[PDB]
Ligand binder design. Structure first.
Ligand SMILES: Oc1ccc(/C(F)=C/c2cc(O)cc(O)c2)cc1
Ligand SMILES: Oc1ccc(/C(F)=C/c2cc(O)cc(O)c2)cc1
Ligand SMILES: [Cl-]
Ligand SMILES: [Cl-]
Ligand SMILES: [Fe+2]
Ligand SMILES: [Fe+2]
Lengths: 497, 497
């Protein structure tokens, strides 16, 4: 077998990116300031964190074992619980005491045959009394919200019709449905997309099979009252390339950014319309909604080149690290239109941004508040000379959060400091009668001075001030998505406005 | 109630001394070099580590909640498990989410009434299939060696005759007895010492009540074939002082360092002879044995002034931090002599030293190898300008280990480097046929450059070279005692040579 290294080497596991790999508890976290005493619930987040050194050099960040953190809040006190998802990969590698799964989404490089290749490392959501740890090449893994024990791969009582479950399901705050899909839904290289939904009682509602014009990456999607929308990143999969040891994904400069629109209820596969946006990268969706005219307003991060530069085109063509900016775009789509090309989007702000969140009480409906990560290169915002040598590589950087009020156009920015960077934020309603976007924002910080993590709590009335700073004595390696589960929401999701 | 701080403040919890307070697992630790594949067993260590900020300012290091680390070795792989002892203090404070126990060994300052005040933070030993977590003001707490679960306060099937159980019991390698005692054995300020022993079947053997000439601290003791030996530190307890909120211990410059000698078997309390060594501090015992003449050779760390400078005399008189050195002394004692004063000891080496260990296969018999911590002020051994600002306070410093061969007088020294300091080492026999002192040494390092801990593995054939360096991604705060439990030893202790 390729030899198993006994310590981590390479930029993707150096500095702040060095895996810690701890599971367990740290109760009664240290707090500077004061956590509002009325906050009650749990912030769950997932990070890729390789449990064992990979036999693949420079294995991307996206390929690390999912480790779940829960921060449990009550009466101004907070406890941390942390535990790895017991994926098939995790369990078999722990038994062997070495890495066995190979390149990102390429089973032809695995040292043993896996049934499920999930690292369950991308999102962690609440559904019907369980956590679902999500990875877009696989079904979810179900976990206990209290103990973080893994129950196992989850198939929705035998109803899951797809091999794949997106990391970005949407929760309709009025119908209480979970709206889902999977791409490559019949296996590696397939153009099959399975669109499906579950009612609040757990029964499958929609199931529609459709065909993507290319086998392209559909990382996120959008849901409105009457439509579902599938933006395709121009990364394309060729299984023959994979069989020779090549990458699952390869950029294609010759295609548009396709945007599929399907009717939300009762459609067939042939009802999808593949609109053609100008070539670019489909980033995360903030939210989509239908306006007065029935036109879809789709608000999402959008870049003009390949954000995932390590997967360049067939000739190795692509940008360099830190070159590509993504911007907060608004695309207008009309399902009734037969004109497939779309105009350049309008842009809501100037900032280089990503990881947008809204008040999920208006998900699928008109929203007027967005919170998002920003990366500002203006001199002095980040002390790059100090941070870069301690940061390692492989992951995006954010040096602030922004809050946009869409009615007024006011933007507030939270800057944690010159030697700190942020993860994705969560929004917590002040209480069940709070106005849209009124309450608290939490965000995990990487402090490069201390080489520790911190959890900042902010009030939306003034996003520039930390109400509390929870000081962890360990690093939580840069991670992906997270969600708030409020103690007053019996089904784990907030009530509609 | 005195207000409960929400983050740690003060020098005793700053820098490398900042509590981490994590419990759980880190498997498959990173290793540089190669752990000898034949090593099989577990290294257990205990550290004081306050679980909650104290309401007592500058609470000493000795007063922190005991947290147990186990490093489990097999086939060149090593896993960490870590867990707090579930003492009455730990459990009641965790329930209240605040500190409740007050000053070190002063129940009159507690905010609630405790039955048992143990922090179980001083030693962790193996006995008859359980771990015993030891603290000299209390009985032991029994724990599971595999899971580190706490079973509860342990009374030896109702046989424990004392309120107090020493942190330094001795294991006789020939008889397989555990030889114990407790001082202040009838309560705060009592001069009662209870000497007692257990046979390998768990039945109590000896129980002798004796009287100390003063209520002084008897931290360690020594055991030979026919005698037990009690060296008294000139810290003295006055319960009336404690009732007014004062310190349990106060130095007394007017007394000798008493050394009690009692016959090991069949004695009465009045058989003890209280020899009088020159005034000084009774440090840890390496080992004691009877020579050809039946005279006791007692080898121990010995200083000329109060090592515990924060507990000065009645008028506040005593040394400053880092001024007192302890040296490796040999006292000669003759139980038949009626001459109570003893000569100044001889010294085995020059180094400022402490935490001596021997090959416990010769415990209570003649030994010819000692391993110990040293603190060398020779310029450049420690880069004090770098280390001191990151170190915090409250704990002793060691910047090397030394191995003395007593037959030849050769000394080898392991220096982990200018920005590292060490804990107490353990010795592991190479195999069951190894000569005395031949095998491996392990020691936990504090790395002040990385602010992480490391576990060094050394071969006694060349103590200057690390065979392996196990790299933890967290800090283990400076700790107290630790022990090896070899997998090949049925009762957990090595066979006699
Ligand atoms: O297995 C995978 C595949 C993709 C991702 C992932 F987070 C993609 C992604 C990351 C970004 O920083 C922005 C963005 O729009 C998308 C994670 C795991
Ligand atoms: O409650 C307690 C009381 C004492 C100790 C302790 F380890 C004392 C000690 C520490 C030294 O550095 C040298 C030495 O000779 C003795 C630990 C906990
Ligand atoms: Cl589990
Ligand atoms: Cl327990
Ligand atoms: Fe995502
Ligand atoms: Fe000790």
């Amino acid at each position: 077998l390729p030899p198993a290294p006994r310590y981590f080497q390479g930029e993707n596991t150096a500095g702040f990116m060095r895996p810690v790999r701890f599971e367990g508890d740290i109760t009664n976290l240290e707090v500077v300031g004061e956590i509002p005493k009325s906050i009650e619930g749990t912030f769950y987040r997932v990070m890729p964190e390789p449990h064992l050194p990979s036999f693949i050099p420079n294995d991307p960040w996206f390929n690390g074992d999912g480790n779940i953190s829960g921060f449990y809040f009550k009466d101004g006190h907070v406890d941390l619980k942390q535990r790895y998802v017991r994926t098939e990969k995790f369990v078999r590698e722990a038994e062997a005491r070495r890495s066995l799964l190979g390149k990102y989404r390429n089973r032809y490089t695995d040292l043993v045959e896996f049934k499920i290749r999930s690292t369950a490392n991308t999102n962690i959501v609440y559904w019907r009394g369980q956590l679902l740890a999500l990875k877009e090449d696989s079904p979810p893994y179900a976990m206990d919200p209290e103990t973080l024990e893994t129950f196992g791969v989850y198939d929705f009582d035998g109803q899951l019709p797809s091999l794949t479950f997106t990391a970005h399901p949407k929760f309709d705050p009025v119908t209480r449905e979970m709206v889902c899909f999977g791409y490559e839904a019949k296996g590696d290289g397939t153009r099959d997309i399975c669109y499906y939904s579950f009612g609040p009682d757990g029964k499958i509602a929609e199931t529609v099979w459709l065909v993507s014009p290319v086998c392209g990456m559909i990382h996120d999607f959008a849901v409105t009252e009457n439509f579902v929308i599938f933006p395709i990143i121009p990364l394309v999969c060729d299984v023959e390339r994979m069989k020779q040891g090549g990458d699952h994904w390869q950029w294609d400069y010759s295609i548009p950014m396709y945007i599929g629109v399907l009717p939300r209820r009762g459609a067939q596969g042939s009802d999808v319309k593949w609109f053609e946006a100008p070539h670019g990268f489909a980033g995360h969706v903030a939210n989509a909604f239908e306006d007065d005219k029935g036109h879809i307003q789709l608000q999402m991060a959008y870049a003009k080149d390949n954000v995932f530069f390590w997967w360049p085109d067939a000739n190795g063509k692509g940008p360099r690290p830190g070159e590509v900016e993504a911007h907060f775009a608004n695309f207008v789509l009309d399902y009734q239109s037969d004109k497939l090309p779309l105009a350049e989007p309008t842009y809501l702000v100037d900032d280089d941004m990503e990881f947008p969140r809204i008040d999920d009480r208006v998900a699928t409906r008109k929203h007027k508040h967005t919170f998002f990560c920003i990366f500002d290169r203006k001199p002095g915002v980040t002390d790059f000379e100090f941070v870069m040598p301690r940061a390692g590589g492989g992951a995006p950087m954010s040096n602030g959060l922004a809050h946009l009020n869409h009615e007024t156009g006011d933007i507030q920015r939270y800057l944690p400091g010159p030697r700190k960077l942020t993860g994705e934020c969560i929004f917590i309603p002040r209480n069940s009668e709070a106005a849209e976007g009124d309450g608290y924002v939490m965000v995990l910080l990487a402090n490069y001075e201390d080489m520790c993590s911190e959890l900042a709590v902010l009030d939306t009335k003034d996003l520039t001030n930390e109400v509390a700073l929870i000081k962890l004595p360990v690093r939580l390696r840069p991670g992906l998505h997270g969600n708030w589960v409020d103690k007053s929401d019996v089904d784990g999701h907030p009530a509609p406005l």
